[PDB]
Amino acid sequence: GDQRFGDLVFRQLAPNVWQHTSYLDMPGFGAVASNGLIVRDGGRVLVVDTAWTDDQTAQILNWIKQEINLPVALAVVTHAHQDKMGGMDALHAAGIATYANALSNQLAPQEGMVAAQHSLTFAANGWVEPATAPNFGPLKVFYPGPGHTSDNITVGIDGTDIAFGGCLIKDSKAKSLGNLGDADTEHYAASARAFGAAFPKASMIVMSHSAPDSRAAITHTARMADKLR
Numbered sequence: 763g764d765q766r767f768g769d770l771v772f773r774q775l776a777p778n779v780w781q782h783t784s785y786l787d788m789p790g791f792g793a794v795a796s797n798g799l800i801v802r803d804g805g806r807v808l809v810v811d812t813a814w815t816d817d818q819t820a821q822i823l824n825w826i827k828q829e830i831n832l833p834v835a836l837a838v839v840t841h842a843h844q845d846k847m848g849g850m851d852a853l854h855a856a857g858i859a860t861y862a863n864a865l866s867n868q869l870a871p872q873e874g875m876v877a878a879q880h881s882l883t884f885a886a887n888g889w890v891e892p893a894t895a896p897n898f899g900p901l902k903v904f905y906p907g908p909g910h911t912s913d914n915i916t917v918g919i920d921g922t923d924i925a926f927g928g929c930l931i932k933d934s935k936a937k938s939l940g941n942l943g944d945a946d947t948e949h950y951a952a953s954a955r956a957f958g959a960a961f962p963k964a965s966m967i968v969m970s971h972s973a974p975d976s977r978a979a980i981t982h983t984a985r986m987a988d989k990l991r
């Protein structure tokens with residue numbers, strides 16, 4: 763199931779969807795896995811999140827070349843932390859168009875990240891304004907409210923049972939909400955529930971630091987964010 767490709771791991775989740783996993787030593791936490799997605803949409807590939815580093819992200823592109831062999835049309839990154847945007851330069855070096863929440867691009871320099879080339883904006887109900895996410899194919903981008911960070915966004919894959927919560931969602935057996943340094947403790951619980959409501963059909967919940975889980979990950983995450991209130 764898990765394909766090891768250099769220092770990264772790739773796992774097929776659906777006929778056109780794979781999870782990419784990369785690792786970074788956090789002095790004091792061990793080697794932390796971070797997950798993103800790779801989606802084939804016809805004759806092109808779409809990426810959700812970089813790896814932690816440029817070198818790892820270039821390796822994602824190398825895996826895509828070997829295992830899919832179609833151009834990567836775009837990447838969308840789900841907030842301005844290293845696990846999700848650390849490899850932006852590698853995407854730009856490869857000529858890939860990049861997208862992030864406008865707020866993520868605003869925060870990127872102070873977070874030590876390189877901004878994406880394009881900014882997503884969101885309607886009052888949280889759905890991306892479609893003019894800012896052109897040619898996204900099956901990717902349905904939703905801002906659930908501030909939680910893990912103020913800029914965190916989420917992505918469902920139309921035609922599959924998969925929704926990606928990024929660092930907002932933890933697995934159903936998780937014991938903590940992880941890094942709350944940039945979190946909105948007041949609104950976290952509501953934002954987690956809004957993600958679940960935006961993607962009611964999704965039975966496979968993919969997230970940044972755990973293997974894919976059932977919808978119990980959403981309910982469990984929300985119950986824990988209640989304790990920050």
Ligand SMILES: COc1ccc2c(CP(=O)(O)O)cc(=O)oc2c1
Nearest residue numbers: 788791794843844845929940941943
């Ligand atoms: C589990 O230990 C971690 C994992 C990730 C982080 C990150 C990246 P994120 O997961 O918050 O996006 C930022 C940080 O300051 O410490 C961390 C500690």
Ligand SMILES: [Zn+2]
Nearest residue numbers: 841843910929
């Ligand atoms: Zn984060």
Ligand SMILES: [Zn+2]
Nearest residue numbers: 845929970971
């Ligand atoms: Zn994280």
